[PDB]
RNA sequence: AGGUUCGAAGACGAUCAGAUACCGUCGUAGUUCCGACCAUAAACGAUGCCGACCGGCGAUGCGGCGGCGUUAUUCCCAUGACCCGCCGGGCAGCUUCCGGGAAACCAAAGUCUUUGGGUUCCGGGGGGAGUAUGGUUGCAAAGCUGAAACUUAAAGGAAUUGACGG
């Protein structure tokens, strides 16, 4: 079970903030490596220069050439 | 080891009530237990209870009237102020028409209605409905 | 694979990696 | 799913039980897990008892018995049909099969 | 092989036996001659098969109480059940062999000291219960 | 029955001891322990005949509390008691069920065998667990003739007498019939009942098939 | 054109029992659906919650049967839920209607506080359980309505409950379990004991003994 | 029930088991309500009036129904004290 | 049995119960007067004595300690102290 | 130190389409003992410890207590071996609509939306991955601590029907 003493608040909060690192949303939002790996750098939109026009094959059940641009 | 005598007694009463026994024996007695049982008896949820007195901590035999649903305990005796007594009340009670919360106050061990009547807070003890 | 044999394969690969790094 | 409450063996309050070798394939089986058969067979065939009695130099000669304790892993037990698979309800009984005296 | 009768013939045979037990007999031809007027059988083969089963069941009935209802068998059973109360009861024994413990029970009940009770010597050894396990 | 008229008589004691009905089994049910006097050196439990009488009188009151005598049903699956339940039903106007009890009798309302009584009288709980279980679907109170090892799961007026002895079963059924008839306006409580308790006794076929011819020889000679 | 085979059904038919509460008092099982329409005629509103196509794999492919969940009840304190699986959807619907009629329970309405007029909410917080679905009904003040998922919302509405908080846990996507748990929670409102019911119960005659003389004459 | 105005706002009042004091539910078909017929003092004949005991399904499924009925009959006077 | 009287248990079960699990704790041991043959004085001996009790007027042993109760030497008499 | 047997590696004979295997013959290290390391197992009850309560039954092990009797010697009790019980602590078993649970099942995995006896460890979809790197321990093998990028819409558990089974 969990501790329930009147002066267990330190252990409760320490365990909570230790266990909060084990879900993906908190880890992504508070580690910063996801922010570094994000090409937009935490921005909603971005601007770029079209390097090329490419076609991407769809997944296994579908069959199409999705039109994309390398930017 | 046994660290909450009141919790053990209340769990024993609840289990005997669920099983349908007519009498329950709670082995470690205390003043807190006697006051809690007196509150429950004055509100009519239990019958008479008799204290077997040995030179150690006594025992109590309670006559169960069959009109008890739950008599749980709040083991960490939180400080209850009159401003948060309502939140405790609607967290622990089945409804606002019945059910009582026993809390130990400076004026004594008594239910939340009397605590609000004489305008005092205290430490939470348990509840019964 | 069997998990035990994946473990063995990984151990072999780790020894090879340690040897390569120690060589440097 | 847990198939058997006793986990297919008699080990209840023990940590380790010494192994034995299967009489058929020499597999190491825990002693409490192996199927044990205590065969007590006439040392001569029931067809040849009369011939041995006739050829005996004695009159009231009691033919000796042969006492062998056999241990089986469950694989050899099932292959040799000493034990058989049973239904989910029928697995729970432990009464040995009847001797069929008559 | 392959002479098992079906419900169509068995039920019909039982019904006509319980209806016309007086007219039926142990002769197959006599039974197959009563069948045409005691029942409507669409087929001659069905009729004679039913008649054969009727002969079999009547042989079984005359040798014993087959489950098929029969008024003579039922009145005999009635006489054998609701009568033959013996002229002397089976519960009016002159003496009753009574255990001392039961005698104490009767004494506590206040029915002790009865002239029709003879106290047995209690057994010694306490050797009840079957030996546990095999062997 | 707490009254002086509602007391066991010496004749009743004599019949009870002659038929047995106090020699229980070697096993004891924890809910049947309260009816036991003492355990013999035989391992046989002795049942308090006074408690048995009180439970029998309570069962008689429960039976006579029903206005329609057909609303009470009597069941004995075992052969040692089918004659008893038939004679009990004949005497008291009850509805008998003997031998095989088809499941769904009290619950499946389609077949013509469907019936719904107001009281369930059972010869033996172990032998008649099926009507006992079916009684819990239709709000059916139950009297059962229980032994020292008889389960009391769905039993309400358990009578602690016997269920193994044919003589005991016949005697207890005859006693219950006599009690309900005397509670009703049938027998005047004074003279002994004219029905011999042997009329309720189950007889084995090797007695049915020889006693009548023995009596025939004794009559012709 | 209704010919009952039941003592209770006969008594209902021949104007011997006046209220469904008389049956509810003695907990007599309702074994035929033509009993309760005689009482709640033209007031039993009906609704179909879901049609689900269960399947059973066989040698020649899998066959499909349709399961119907049907909730009925007048908006005054009676509600019932019936589940019936049948080959045809219409047959399943009719069977589910019959089963919902059979399984009609009364609903106890209480007050959140300051009892003024007609009761509007559950008398206390009640928990229904079915599978992994746990449904808790909490009393609510006047005018809040039913706050809940739609599937328990319609059931609580046709049960006559005006205001109620709901809290559900588990796989509530399982509509059958999620409706059955709420039905259990509604049904145990009387099973819950409250101090206003502490009075010692006076016992009245059961219908079976009250009309035993008429039953002998009519229901042979 | 029994709002401030005083009237009983409740369509029916369920029975309570005479042993465990538990509410007998509407769909609890295991429950029973039997009648025990008491007799007159002098002749032991049924006098018409009786007394009723109700037992809930939980009690008469756990098996304490016989003990419950016996205790109630003892308390009410049906069973003699020297039982 | 839902209605066992816990307040007033009869002495039979009161004695069969464990010493600590009784309603009030009661030791199973006692004190006894012991008479050694050939001696006049009376020795007070614990029933569960752990030591070899000896007479001061005679070089004789009165009891031998065992697992549960001191086994008195043969020829010695004994009586209880006040039940 | 010792090395009988068995037997990783290895050799050979078979089998096979191939057969670095399953089968057979031989056989090194090991398996044995003493001393020093390692600290891992489906190290399992896949189930933390302490405490209380909540059904029944028959057994079993130890200790104690009380009883008809049988048995051992002896002249009687003790003391052993049985028989019948009671108590306490254990290994368990059968049964049950106590109750729980997704169910299998569990008298604990119960006394949980009627949620609080005390306390420790620990999980957060599947992979990547128990991987990389850093630290630390070790003679080594390795042990402990332990990511991220990226990828994915399921992966899983229990049960039901069918199909299939050398
Ligand atoms: Mg498997
Ligand atoms: Mg191990
Ligand atoms: Mg070799
Ligand atoms: Mg803790
Ligand atoms: Mg993960
Ligand atoms: Zn083998």
Swiss-Prot record, chain B:
The gene is RPS15A. Belongs to the universal ribosomal protein uS8 family. Its main location: cytoplasm. Component of the small ribosomal subunit. Part of the small subunit (SSU) processome, first precursor of the small eukaryotic ribosomal subunit. During the assembly of the SSU processome in the nucleolus, many ribosome biogenesis factors, an RNA chaperone and ribosomal proteins associate with the nascent pre-rRNA and work in concert to generate RNA folding, modifications, rearrangements and cleavage as well as targeted degradation of pre-ribosomal RNA by the RNA exosome. Required for proper erythropoiesis. It comes from Homo sapiens (Human). GO terms for molecular function: RNA binding; structural constituent of ribosome. It is linked to Diamond-Blackfan anemia 20: A form of Diamond-Blackfan anemia, a congenital non-regenerative hypoplastic anemia that usually presents early in infancy. Diamond-Blackfan anemia is characterized by a moderate to severe macrocytic anemia, erythroblastopenia, and an increased risk of malignancy. 30 to 40% of Diamond-Blackfan anemia patients present with short stature and congenital anomalies, the most frequent being craniofacial (Pierre-Robin syndrome and cleft palate), thumb and urogenital anomalies. DBA20 inheritance is autosomal dominant. PROSITE patterns: RIBOSOMAL_S8 (PS00053). It is found in: Cytoplasm; Nucleus, Nucleolus. The modification N6-succinyllysine is found at residue 87.
UniProtKB/Swiss-Prot annotation, chain D:
This is Small ribosomal subunit protein eS26. It comes from the Eukaryota. Belongs to the eukaryotic ribosomal protein eS26 family. Residues 86-96 have a biased composition (Basic and acidic residues). Keywords: Cytoplasm, Diamond-Blackfan anemia, Disease variant, Endoplasmic reticulum, Phosphoprotein, Ribonucleoprotein, Ribosomal protein. It is linked to Diamond-Blackfan anemia 10: A form of Diamond-Blackfan anemia, a congenital non-regenerative hypoplastic anemia that usually presents early in infancy. Diamond-Blackfan anemia is characterized by a moderate to severe macrocytic anemia, erythroblastopenia, and an increased risk of malignancy. 30 to 40% of Diamond-Blackfan anemia patients present with short stature and congenital anomalies, the most frequent being craniofacial (Pierre-Robin syndrome and cleft palate), thumb and urogenital anomalies. GO terms for biological process: cytoplasmic translation; negative regulation of RNA splicing; translation. GO terms for molecular function: cadherin binding; mRNA binding; RNA binding; structural constituent of ribosome. Pfam families: Ribosomal_S26e. The keyword RNA-binding does not apply. The modification Phosphoserine is found at residue 53. The keyword Iron does not apply. Component of the 40S small ribosomal subunit. Residues 84-102 are annotated as: Disordered. The lineage of its organism: Eukaryota, Metazoa, Chordata, Craniata, Vertebrata.
Curated annotation (Swiss-Prot), chain H:
Keywords: Acetylation, Cytoplasm, Endoplasmic reticulum, Isopeptide bond, Ribonucleoprotein, Ribosomal protein, Ubl conjugation. The modification N-acetylmethionine is found at residue 1. GO terms for cellular component: cytoplasm; cytosol; cytosolic ribosome; cytosolic small ribosomal subunit; endoplasmic reticulum; nucleoplasm; rough endoplasmic reticulum; small ribosomal subunit. PROSITE patterns: RIBOSOMAL_S21E. There is a cross-link at residue 41 (Glycyl lysine isopeptide (Lys-Gly) (interchain with G-Cter in SUMO2)). The keyword Ribosomal protein applies. The modification N6-acetyllysine is found at residue 81. It comes from the Eukaryota. Coiled coil: none annotated. It is found in: Cytoplasm, Cytosol; Cytoplasm; Rough endoplasmic reticulum. The keyword Lipid metabolism does not apply. One of its GO terms (biological process) is endonucleolytic cleavage to generate mature 3'-end of SSU-rRNA from (SSU-rRNA, 5.8S rRNA, LSU-rRNA). One of its GO terms (molecular function) is RNA binding. PANTHER family: 40S RIBOSOMAL PROTEIN S21. Component of the 40S small ribosomal subunit. Belongs to the eukaryotic ribosomal protein eS21 family. This is Small ribosomal subunit protein eS21. The lineage of its organism: Eukaryota, Metazoa, Chordata, Craniata, Vertebrata.
Swiss-Prot record, chain I:
Component of the small ribosomal subunit. Part of the small subunit (SSU) processome, composed of more than 70 proteins and the RNA chaperone small nucleolar RNA (snoRNA) U3. The modification Phosphoserine is found at residue 10. It is found in: Cytoplasm; Nucleus, Nucleolus. Expressed in a wide variety of actively proliferating cells and tumor tissues. Belongs to the eukaryotic ribosomal protein eS27 family. Component of the small ribosomal subunit. The ribosome is a large ribonucleoprotein complex responsible for the synthesis of proteins in the cell. Required for proper rRNA processing and maturation of 18S rRNAs. Part of the small subunit (SSU) processome, first precursor of the small eukaryotic ribosomal subunit. Residues 1-22 are annotated as: Disordered. It comes from the Eukaryota. GO terms for molecular function: DNA binding; RNA binding; structural constituent of ribosome; zinc ion binding. PROSITE patterns: RIBOSOMAL_S27E (PS01168). The gene is RPS27. A zinc finger (C4-type) spans 36-58. Pfam families: Ribosomal_S27e. This is Small ribosomal subunit protein eS27. HAMAP family: Ribosomal_eS27 (MF_00371). GO terms for biological process: cytoplasmic translation; ribosomal small subunit assembly; ribosomal small subunit biogenesis; rRNA processing; translation. Its main location: cytoplasm. Binds 1 zinc ion per subunit.
